[PDB]
Amino acid sequence: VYSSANNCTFEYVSQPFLMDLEGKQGNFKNLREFVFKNIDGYFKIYSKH
């Protein structure tokens, strides 16, 4: 995902979330929407499965 890193301050973990790593070629069964905003530097997350 990257080569290296030097310095930073923020790091967030929150609750664990599980996926399925097996990929198929069938029809989709879920829909996920995400909204990313930045007002006065504040980062916003909006999502609902």
Ligand X SMILES: *[C@@H]1O[C@H](CO)[C@@H](O)[C@H](O)[C@H]1NC(C)=O
Report the interface residues with ligand X, using CB under 6 A. Answer: 6-7, 9
User: What minimum distance in Å lies between the beta carbon of 4 and ligand X?
Assistant: 12
Shortest distance (Å) from residue 13 CB to ligand X: 20
Question: Distance (Å, rounded) from C-alpha 36 to C-alpha 46?
Answer: 7
Chain-centroid distance of CA 49 in Å reads 13
Q: Are 45 and 34 in contact (CB under 8 A)?
A: yes
For the CB of residue 10, give the shortest distance to ligand X in the complex, in Å: 10
Residue nearest to ligand X (CB): 7
